[PDB]
Symmetry: D2
Subunit: 332 residues, 4 copies
Amino acid sequence: MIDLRSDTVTRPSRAMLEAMMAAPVGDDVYGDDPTVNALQDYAAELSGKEAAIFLPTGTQANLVALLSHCERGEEYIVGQAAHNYLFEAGGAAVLGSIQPQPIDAAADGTLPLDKVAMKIKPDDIHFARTKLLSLENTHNGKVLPREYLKEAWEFTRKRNLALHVDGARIFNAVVAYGCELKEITQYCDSFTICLSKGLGTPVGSLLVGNRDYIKRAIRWRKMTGGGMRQSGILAAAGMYALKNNVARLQEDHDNTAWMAEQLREAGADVMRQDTNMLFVRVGEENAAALGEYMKARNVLINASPIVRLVTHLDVSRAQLAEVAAHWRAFLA
Amino acid sequence: MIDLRSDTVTRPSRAMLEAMMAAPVGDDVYGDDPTVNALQDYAAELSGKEAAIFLPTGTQANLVALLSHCERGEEYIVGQAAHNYLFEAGGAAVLGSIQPQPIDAAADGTLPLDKVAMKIKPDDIHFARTKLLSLENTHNGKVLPREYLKEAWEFTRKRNLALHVDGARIFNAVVAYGCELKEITQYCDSFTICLSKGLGTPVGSLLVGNRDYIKRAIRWRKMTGGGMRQSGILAAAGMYALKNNVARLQEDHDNTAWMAEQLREAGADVMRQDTNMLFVRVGEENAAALGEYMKARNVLINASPIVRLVTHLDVSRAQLAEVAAHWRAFLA
Amino acid sequence: MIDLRSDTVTRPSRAMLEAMMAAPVGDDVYGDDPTVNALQDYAAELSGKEAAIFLPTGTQANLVALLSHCERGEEYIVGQAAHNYLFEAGGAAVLGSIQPQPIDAAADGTLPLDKVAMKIKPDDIHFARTKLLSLENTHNGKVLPREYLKEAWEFTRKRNLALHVDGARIFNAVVAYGCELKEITQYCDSFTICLSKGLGTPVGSLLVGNRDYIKRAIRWRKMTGGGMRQSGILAAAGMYALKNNVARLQEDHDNTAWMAEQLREAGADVMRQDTNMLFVRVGEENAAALGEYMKARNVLINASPIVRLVTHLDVSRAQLAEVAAHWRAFLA
Amino acid sequence: MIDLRSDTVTRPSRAMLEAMMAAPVGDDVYGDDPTVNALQDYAAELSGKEAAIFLPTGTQANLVALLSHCERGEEYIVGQAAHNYLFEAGGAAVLGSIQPQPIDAAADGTLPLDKVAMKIKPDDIHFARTKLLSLENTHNGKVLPREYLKEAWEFTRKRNLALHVDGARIFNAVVAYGCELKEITQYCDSFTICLSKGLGTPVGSLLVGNRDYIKRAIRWRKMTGGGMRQSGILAAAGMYALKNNVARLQEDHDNTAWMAEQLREAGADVMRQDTNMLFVRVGEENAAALGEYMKARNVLINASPIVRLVTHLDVSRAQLAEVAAHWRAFLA
Ligand SMILES: Cc1ncc(COP(=O)(O)O)c(CN[C@H](C(=O)O)[C@@H](C)O)c1O
Ligand SMILES: Cc1ncc(COP(=O)(O)O)c(CN[C@H](C(=O)O)[C@@H](C)O)c1O
Ligand SMILES: Cc1ncc(COP(=O)(O)O)c(CNCC(=O)O)c1O
Ligand SMILES: Cc1ncc(COP(=O)(O)O)c(CNCC(=O)O)c1O
Ligand SMILES: [Cl-]
Ligand SMILES: [Mg+2]
Ligand SMILES: [Mg+2]
Ligand SMILES: [Mg+2]
Ligand SMILES: [Mg+2]
Ligand SMILES: [Mg+2]
Ligand SMILES: [Mg+2]
């Protein structure tokens, strides 16, 4: 089975499973789970932050981050296509009583600061109270320019606004920058880390930030339903992932870069390629046809006019070759 | 005094006050105020709708309108600069648990239906549930083209979306169209009518729609705090205004077109004139100074880079001539 | 028409109407309404508080007070039968994301402090965060003992909790205590005043408290839809009420005390009498019969097994005699 | 170590861990995890319901259950000491916009139906809309009488209310009843099953109900953050527990009855013993001291005036004998 629908489908390696089954555990609600604590301390330390908290999903990581930053009536400036505005079902507004102020991202994935500036509300009773700027790195595989990350950080300080980064795929960006995680997380107040995508974990995400901030985050995690018990079994996998699966993300990137060239030399229309993502304009007509045609040969893609292919540790290059052949044969 | 800050500054005429002091009243919570009932029946009949509800303000009329249309987790497509998104402190999301989905309006004030369609969410757990399209007529004085109004209605019927129109200045649109109110309200499920701006009432707005919709609105009005007692005294002004203050809106319109030419003559940079509003680019270097200079001559404006001047029954052409002379002196 | 359903049905006297029609007004949103400001300053001054804000209803006065005191996730201890828990449709929870912790009041109308104490939550992530204690004076005509008001005040300071008093009928209690308003409002951080009940106003209520508190209240009043324009027309009536209708509440009380004795000597079962309220156990059977039987002779009561009769300025004693006759005749 | 803090402290048996490491997984968001699907199908079939949904915690299971049953402005009748009212940080109201209506449970843990009926709100705009009755089985170890369960169900059908049962320890009730699960679940619309307490799972709870109800729950799970990926590894433990850890709950029960007698012998004041819980009145003068003394001997308890001791598969009778000896030494 060749699954290119997303990097969320990565399954645990035997080594990861072993680390999981041998991890000492405790009751996380009581703060007695050794492995959970260890994962959190390690993440805080690696990012230059004071604390971190483990969550069941990146969606809850963001929901909690937003609740922790914004009180009732406050607002967050975010992307119209950002995950914590568009793909978390309006959670920040629906459950958190937070006003979202979405704006279109530039082609490079950043939120134009001149545009963010026009959305910062005056301190007048007619408006929501602007409090947070939220970013997303990577954004649809897009690695945000580092100069912008720094400028966004400077700008938010000037405007007394906090800055959050949805880092579901932050390690993909890190590998692509060729720098240390800390050199990019210094430009935010808080950020998330998904362990269940390219890092290969079964479940789990982390929210990282200032001690006091994280303390509030614990309150919100409890209310939203993410305060688990012996979650050390899951956190164990995250530690294994962070110590063994970061560098090979480069293989996912090289594989995507390779596949783009393949599909290219196969009649396919590759719109763009970034880190572990490739976007192909298949078109309305062949969209559903291609979907079934692939699934028939154990190749899974989220069929659509513009298909998003995502590489990861459970897809090898030979497997990409075979999918490339099938795609080159489909065009007949 | 000469007030061009907004049309909300209108004060009761002598005739309106008499109607008020002479109106029969009752407890509106019990549904026993003859004047509120009469006002609501008249507005309903005048617009071709089943029912109407009187509220303390247009803000509450919209908040209640949004709550009546969208249940928790649902979403409304609306303008980035629309009043019930930008100027009501994010009430729909904060208090209502509704996801707002703003988009930029086109220059004529409409929300391009191609963009609205791009925002309708698929029925998938990752998204909010698109339920309503909210419009604004007039929008900063701009009158929406009638063809678009019919187009939006048809568009929403086809896509099973409700259509709400914030009609704070809908009679300014009606007068400008040269048609009957009902000829434009047939293109919406619900709409609001502000009585306290150009129509000259001291307080009050109305929400109009079908009987079932309004019955839900009544519950939301109570909860949000608009369930008043002897509001008949306030409703009486509304009735006086709808019967005696609608046609004269043409005077305000003529006065704004006139003032626009007077200022153009004076050297001011008039950006645009639409119904009872005209926009002047004063610029940052003169913003505050113009505000003080005018305030000195007993002319009140909302100083700002781009000054919005609003006309109404409490500002005459002669007074506008004086303002144009002061402005003229200011520039040179 | 003899209306005993509530004191909310009081209509404006000619003098009140005159004060209303002659009051100088402004735009309250801009803070330019002279009469609104005057009503607020006078109320703050009379109660020893720093500021006050005028609202369309007592319901919005409480909704706003609760929002101003409690942030998302905080909690207020209140009565199971208190108006801002039971009769405002769950507004504090529904719109404000505030957890209500209701408890049964004692027979005297107070919230037993030993009981309030057991409901104050530990600072643990499993619980809502206790922040406010809310009272109600009068509570179903019941005048709360002054010693308790003082003890409740002392207790909340010891527990670092704010204290709010729903004073819809605070002047009835004031008259019954025979003291100055300030001697009872010193035992709370904020309180409300309804002008539209025994005080005789058509619409309106006031929220009073600390400057900073009230400033937040202005934000919430705007969002909830209570920020009106020329509301000086309404506030004028409140000033007239506060300067002319406070002392005669004693007449309502004497009238209630008189009627109790009458209905008593008529076969009626008077359960209790407090200030301007009388409660009669009519029973399931005669409940609906009595309702229609009265309405037939222009006597309006909220028919029920236990009828609540409320006296006020629009009911004279002769009128109570006539209703007493009808009730004594109904028992045949 | 000897942990009597709660049954949530249970750690995976050797057999459970093997089942976990050997379970086939998939992406649960896509509905492709065979083990989650199997767990959900098994629970549904075992309880006579149409569907089930796996969640990270019982808190989320209840939050989602409440959201699925009550729309905004609706209300649930629930116990003042019930977990989804008292111990979930007011989530239903704070995040869900649902009015909670708590009432004291009777000594046997049921909510007296006469009191529940007194709380059903009339259909009037002043009230929240009563929608759900929530129950707790077991409640602090107390098993609800089966006659009451049938009585509540019948009561809610007659009054058109849905019935939810928080079944964190429902198998403790089942074992105590000596009947099949389905014989008690027929008396509710929905119920939860906690897998991480007495059943010995590291994490996880289940919400069970009809297909339509569960489909709405799936949306709320996503929004609140419980939409995990390869949760099959966690679901596998749940399946192992339901098939191998239910009958032994009787051992925990016997151990608690035994420990209660051991402590009575030692001079402790045993308030009550119900299933796997026993309550000891330690008193304020000895609360903290007992906590330290025990913690010294490697026995963990939740020190407090009234200490709640909870038994489970990780505490044997021999260990309970040691605790009884330490306690005995403590007292004299
Ligand atoms: C299009 C529109 N809709 C709704 C409202 C709310 O009505 P209110 O709550 O009674 O004020 C206004 C108010 N117009 C003001 C104005 O243009 O002067 C603006 C500052 O809020 C408005 O222009
Ligand atoms: C009756 C009941 N319902 C729901 C829950 C929520 O389940 P969780 O979110 O997985 O913890 C608990 C937890 N029981 C804990 C206990 O008894 O030790 C209590 C502190 O929260 C419970 O006892
Ligand atoms: C940028 C981003 N942020 C947050 C999340 C939330 O994570 P959970 O799905 O674990 O809740 C995702 C999920 N990613 C979906 C995909 O790209 O396939 C994501 O891509
Ligand atoms: C104690 C109390 N508090 C607040 C309110 C809210 O006021 P509005 O109705 O103006 O929103 C009322 C209304 N009183 C209802 C009655 O006794 O008839 C009340 O009695
Ligand atoms: Cl809803
Ligand atoms: Mg994975
Ligand atoms: Mg909300
Ligand atoms: Mg006006
Ligand atoms: Mg009145
Ligand atoms: Mg809420
Ligand atoms: Mg466990």
